């Protein structure tokens, strides 16, 4: 896809020099991003591979300073 | 698509609080000149009421459309509360450094203060008009300068603004009584709110339309919407018994061949979770939404037939759809019950008024099973209105679970029988299949009580009455998903969290309030259209708007007939007080606005009589008339519906006096030479040749010193006489003092929209949770 080309061209050309602070960089914001996605429909666990889905909706009460952190990142 | 519907539903924001920054105004003062009698012009000017935004179309139907649009404007400005200080401003000439209500009021007062041509009394009156307060009562009185109709609207918005004094008791009283009297929940708050505070009450008026009476396509969507919403709030089964630590106990109880677990000899099919929770969710959400549910099972699986008993006992039978339970009851009778007494299989009829349990209740002779089937057949809902809302309630024996004891009695009897007609393997299979439920008895009792408890608890959080009516689309229910729930359960209570309850209640409240509010909108415009004679107007797009603001339908594929029936029901609804009063305040002043507005005229007289002109004063001499008495009148909208220019042509060829009535344009003519030449009589000949009447523009003979030939009037001793006057009123004269009023308001309140956010809420420990009967639920072990 197109986005694959953009991503691959943008990592291949920078991974030729940066080799210590690159995968650590782009893989770090994800930990914040997961706190932004509203649940509409859910999965549960009972015993180690059981599921029992739930139509529960949950909003995303994210504070403001983590956006400033994310912005710095 | 399932989740999307709930995304639309749960994104229903409440009714957005309105708050105006200015005052509704249609009029404004305006300096015009004044022409002293004999025609010549004063050095002085004079204030008059004139209209803001002269935009009236031509023709009467279009004018009534204008007033309908104006009614819509007034509704959109029509506020819910207001604090006059937020629009108040200083007065640049007040003795006491007071204030006035509007910026334009201050502009008026400061422009009238500067003119040479103002009395001293009015300047004093402006210096002495100020605000006042009385803070013990939190009341304010501001001055204002307002046309009377504008004063009427603004004063109505003052006296009929929907707010209520907020306190700490109404917060509690806003919750239904059942939750408050249920000891499993504890409520509190961390704030006291003053009596300066406010809150708006929703409109929780029940269905004025009876959409459960032959609006089945809408009721299906509604019932599905409430079902899928209810699925999002029923709790998850947090704790169970393991699914493999159970199945080995079941297998050894059944004494099955090794490694048939992966083949699933039909007892063991679909025992898993991911079905038990599905059943738990579906039953409760359907009974809450009153949605019919169909059953997809198999006859090789005898456990499905066995768990259908528990289902058809704990749940009424009028709650399912007919063919499904007919099939299921038939199967049960044919392979568990009639075989247990050597009876024949059955002879059942397709189009039979009775279901197999009914026609089986009288044939077989055993007391236990007979009374069980009696209970099942005559189980049905009980309608009852509580807290205003209708509710479909259970028997009060299902709730405090003892129905399961009748079930066990019947099943134990059937265990105790012999099967003479049938082999040993068959008997063995059946009796083991029902022993697997006997061993789960206490857990089943607890399950039944838990369903009943959660059902009534969630019933409490309903605002719209819940009718027991069948629906187009159903919900599938595999009985293996029942068997799972009935077999993977124990010592694990689930109570809906209070916040989920409050969420569900506010969602339903906001949905209901939106529903009533949009109904009120549609009812206002519909009633108004019928009372303003708007006859070319197809009352569909209004209904399209109505259905679009209820954010669950697909208006692109709903027809026109349902919309028109909805209109037909809406015709017969009383209009709410606000809209009705605003409309009856508009019906009594639309004409007085229409007597104003120098872009249309209310008629033209063609009277072959050399009549005198009137000594008005904003004009000099004009060919104007203000009564329309004497001459017979002809309505033009009738003539433009039905083109019959025979009458009028007859009247023109014979020079007969007449008046023509309807919103007509006009053109001012400051030429005396157009008066003696009589050009205004030259305009009506184009009506007989090209029979259209659209390019009809009579003349207004405004005469004054600004006319470039006026000197004749002031040299030759002739009063201006003329022909073919125009039917029009004059503007009214601006009396500053009589136009002044005092507007009242409350001083500095604060409006709180959400109402349960101040409540913090907690549950007793769900192991020790108790029902209405002062007897614990989830206690059997």
Automatic annotation (TrEMBL), chain A:
Location of the protein in the cell: Virion
Superkingdom of the organism of origin: Viruses
Protein purpose: RNA-directed RNA polymerase that is involved in both transcription and genome replication. Together with VP3 capping enzyme, forms an enzyme complex positioned near the channels situated at each of the five-fold vertices of the core. Following infection, the outermost layer of the virus is lost, leaving a double-layered particle (DLP) made up of the core and VP6 shell. VP1 then catalyzes the transcription of fully conservative plus-strand genomic RNAs that are extruded through the DLP's channels into the cytoplasm where they function as mRNAs for translation of viral proteins.
Family from the record: Belongs to the reoviridae RNA-directed RNA polymerase family.
Subunit comment: Interacts with VP3 (Potential). Interacts with VP2; this interaction activates VP1. Interacts with NSP5; this interaction is probably necessary for the formation of functional virus factories. Interacts with NSP2; this interaction is weak.
Protein name, entry field: RNA-directed RNA polymerase
The organism of origin for this protein: Rotavirus A (strain RVA/Monkey/United States/RRV/1975/G3P5B[3]) (RV-A)
Lineage of producing organism: Viruses, Riboviria, Orthornavirae, Duplornaviricota, Resentoviricetes
Region of the whole protein represented: 219 to 291 of 1088
Automatic annotation (TrEMBL), chain B:
Entry annotated with the keyword ATP-binding: no
Subcellular location: Virion
PTM remark: Sumoylated with SUMO1 and SUMO2. Sumoylation of viral proteins seems to have a positive role on viral replication.
UniProt entry keywords in alphabetical sequence: Capsid protein, Inner capsid protein, Repeat, RNA-binding, T=2 icosahedral capsid protein, Ubl conjugation, Virion
Assigned GO CC terms: T=2 icosahedral viral capsid; viral inner capsid; viral nucleocapsid
Site entry: Interaction with the intermediate capsid protein VP6: 125, 129, 740, 742
Region entry Hydrophobic, spans: 295-315, 323-343
GO molecular function: RNA binding
Main location: virion
Signal peptide from the UniProt entry: none
Record-linked InterPro entries: Rotavirus_VP2
Superkingdom of the organism of origin: Viruses
Record remark: domains: The N-terminus binds RNA. It is necessary for encapsidation of VP1 and VP3. The N-termini of 10 VP2 molecules form a cylindrical hub underneath each 5-fold axis of the inner capsid.
Description of how the protein assembles with itself and partners: Homodecamer; each decamer is made up of two conformers of VP2, called VP2A and VP2B. Interacts with a VP1-VP3 complex. Interacts with the intermediate capsid protein VP6. Interacts with NSP5. Interacts (via N-terminus) with NSP2.
Record's function text: Inner capsid protein that self-assembles to form an icosahedral capsid with a T=2 symmetry, which consists of 120 copies of VP2, with channels at each of its five-fold vertices. This capsid constitutes the innermost concentric layer of the viral mature particle. It encapsidates the polymerase VP1, the capping enzyme VP3 and the genomic dsRNA, thereby defining the core.
Family the entry assigns: Belongs to the rotavirus VP2 family.
Protein name, as recorded: Inner capsid protein VP2
Annotated source species: Rotavirus A (strain RVA/Monkey/United States/RRV/1975/G3P5B[3])
